[PDB]
Amino acid sequence: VTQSFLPPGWEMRIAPNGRPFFIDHNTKTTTWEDPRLKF
């Protein structure tokens, strides 16, 4: 039941076209690439 965390200031949403996307509030930017693939 352990959750997988994004780094601080990041959140995931689902776009209307069905793709997940990621908001980086630290830089006020968005990306299709999940940071967790990049740890």
Numbering used by the authors: 494 to 532
Share the article's original sentences.
Several sets of host cell machinery facilitate this process, including proteins of the endosomal sorting complexes required for transport pathway, which mediates the membrane fission reaction required to complete viral budding, as well as angiomotin (AMOT) and NEDD4L, which bind one another and promote virion membrane envelopment. AMOT and NEDD4L interact through the four NEDD4L WW domains and three different AMOT Pro-Pro-x (any amino acid)-Tyr (PPxY) motifs, but these interactions are not yet well defined. Here, we report that individual AMOT PPxY and NEDD4L WW domains interact with the following general affinity hierarchies: AMOT PPxY1>PPxY2>PPxY3 and NEDD4L WW3>WW2>WW1∼WW4. Comparative structural, binding, and virological analyses reveal that complementary ionic and hydrophobic contacts on both sides of the WW–PPxY core interaction account for the unusually high affinity of the AMOT PPxY1–NEDD4L WW3 interaction.
Attempts to crystallize the high-affinity AMOT PPxY1–NEDD4L WW3 complex repeatedly yielded crystals of NEDD4L WW3 alone. The explanation for this became evident when we determined the apo-NEDD4L WW3 structure and observed that in the preferred crystal lattice, a proline-rich element from the N terminus of one NEDD4L WW3 domain (cryptic peptide, residues 498FLPP501) bound in the PPxY-binding site of a neighboring molecule. The cryptic peptide binds in the opposite orientation of AMOT PPxY peptides and is therefore not discussed further. All five of our new structures exhibit canonical WW domains, with three-stranded β-sheets and canonical positioning of the two eponymous Trp residues. The three WW–PPxY complexes and the WW3 cryptic peptide complex are superimposable (<1.0 Å RMSD), whereas the apo WW3 WW domain structure (∼3.0 Å RMSD) differed in significant ways.
